[PDB]
Amino acid sequence: SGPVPSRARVYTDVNTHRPREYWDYESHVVEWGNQDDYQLVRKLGRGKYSEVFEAINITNNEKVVVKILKPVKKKKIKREIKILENLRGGPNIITLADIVKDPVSRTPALVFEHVNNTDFKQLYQTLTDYDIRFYMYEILKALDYCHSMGIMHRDVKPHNVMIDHEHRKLRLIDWGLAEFYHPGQEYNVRVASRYFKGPELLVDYQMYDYSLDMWSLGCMLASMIFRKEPFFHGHDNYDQLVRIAKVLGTEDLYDYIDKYNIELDPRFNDILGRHSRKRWERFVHSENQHLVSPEALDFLDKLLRYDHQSRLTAREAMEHPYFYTVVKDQA
Numbered sequence: 001s002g003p004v005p006s007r008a009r010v011y012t013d014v015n016t017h018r019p020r021e022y023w024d025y026e027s028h029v030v031e032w033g034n035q036d037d038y039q040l041v042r043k044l045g046r047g048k049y050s051e052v053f054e055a056i057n058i059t060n061n062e063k064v065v066v067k068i069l070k071p072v073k074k075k076k077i078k079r080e081i082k083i084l085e086n087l088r089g090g091p092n093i094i095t096l097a098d099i100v101k102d103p104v105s106r107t108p109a110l111v112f113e114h115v116n117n118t119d120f121k122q123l124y125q126t127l128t129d130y131d132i133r134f135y136m137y138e139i140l141k142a143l144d145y146c147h148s149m150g151i152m153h154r155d156v157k158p159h160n161v162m163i164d165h166e167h168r169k170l171r172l173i174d175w176g177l178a179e180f181y182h183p184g185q186e187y188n189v190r191v192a193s194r195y196f197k198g199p200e201l202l203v204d205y206q207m208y209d210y211s212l213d214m215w216s217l218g219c220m221l222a223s224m225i226f227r228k229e230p231f232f233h234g235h236d237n238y239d240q241l242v243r244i245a246k247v248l249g250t251e252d253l254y255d256y257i258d259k260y261n262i263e264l265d266p267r268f269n270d271i272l273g274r275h276s277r278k279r280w281e282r283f284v285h286s287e288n289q290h291l292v293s294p295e296a297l298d299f300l301d302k303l304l305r306y307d308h309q310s311r312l313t314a315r316e317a318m319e320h321p322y323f324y325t326v327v328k329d330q331a
């Protein structure tokens with residue numbers, strides 16, 4: 001009894017009709033920049049594969065960000081950077097300003113736009129129903145962009161969404177987990193933050209597509225409109241599924257497991273329990289009411305769907321009344 005195969009409902013063969021050079025990042029030959037152009041000012045964060053610095057461009061005195069890369073894997077390095085390059089110029093997509101060959105490592109460093117990030121600590125008490133809509137929309141553009149460009153981001157979460165609230169500047173960052181979609185292809189499930197994991201990952205189902213990202217985003221929206229960070233708060237990957245099944249409910253879950261002949265580790269049976277589908281009304285109170293609206297609950301209700309093929313696409317989400325008001329464009 002095997003798992004039923006899946007295709008992207010949209011943008012399936014985007015890489016399929018692109019020249020090999022576009023998606024074969026292995027054969028990509030990088031052209032490095034001048035590491036002496038840049039001086040590191042402060043450390044701004046560190047993961048467990050990299051270290052992020054505030055930096056300076058000494059030819060012009062501009063602020064940048066410098067991602068130095070602990071000696072990981074040539075394959076992994078060139079992916080992020082082929083992708084970063086494939087998407088440069090797109091909406092709200094962080095600009096890769098430079099690439100540099102680095103001493104610190106026997107590996108290198110990437111140089112990005114500075115985004116003077118309003119901290120999500122005094123952002124979360126200034127933001128308005130309109131603000132979130134605006135920002136949801138801008139991130140959607142980024143996610144439609146890169147999806148249309150044959151690419152899943154795989155690590156959507158509020159830290160990878162820098163926002164300079166003062167200029168209304170949103171860029172989407174951290175494409176180190178990002179990967180090309182090829183239909184038919186089984187992928188790593190160990191991507192994305194726990195809280196932002198799609199059910200297809202939590203259920204070890206690998207033939208996922210872009211709509212993973214719509215899940216993550218979808219949790220984000222939940223978060224912001226409900227003033228709860230993270231919305232789904234589990235203590236490991238098992239717990240997380242429980243924390244989802246307590247609002248989405250066990251029925252539709254087990255039907256999702258049913259459609260894709262996905263077979264679940266037996267231990268999951270006893271923790272998973274039996275839960276009903278809660279109304280999205282149930283999480284509206286007095287502190288978060290002013291951000292919650294029928295358009296929203298409904299918008300949201302179309303992203304958090306077990307069945308990956310069910311989730312709204314980026315295109316459709318941007319075409320949702322929730323976003324109508326959003327200041328509609330031109331010269």
Ligand SMILES: COc1ccc(/C=C2\Oc3cc(OCC(=O)O)ccc3C2=O)cc1OC
Binds near residue numbers: 065112113116162
């Ligand atoms: C609230 O504290 C801050 C935290 C982060 C920033 C700015 C930035 O942090 C980044 C991390 C980045 O990671 C690059 C990557 O991991 O892909 C890229 C750009 C920025 C970036 O512009 C600015 C901040 O204000 C001092």
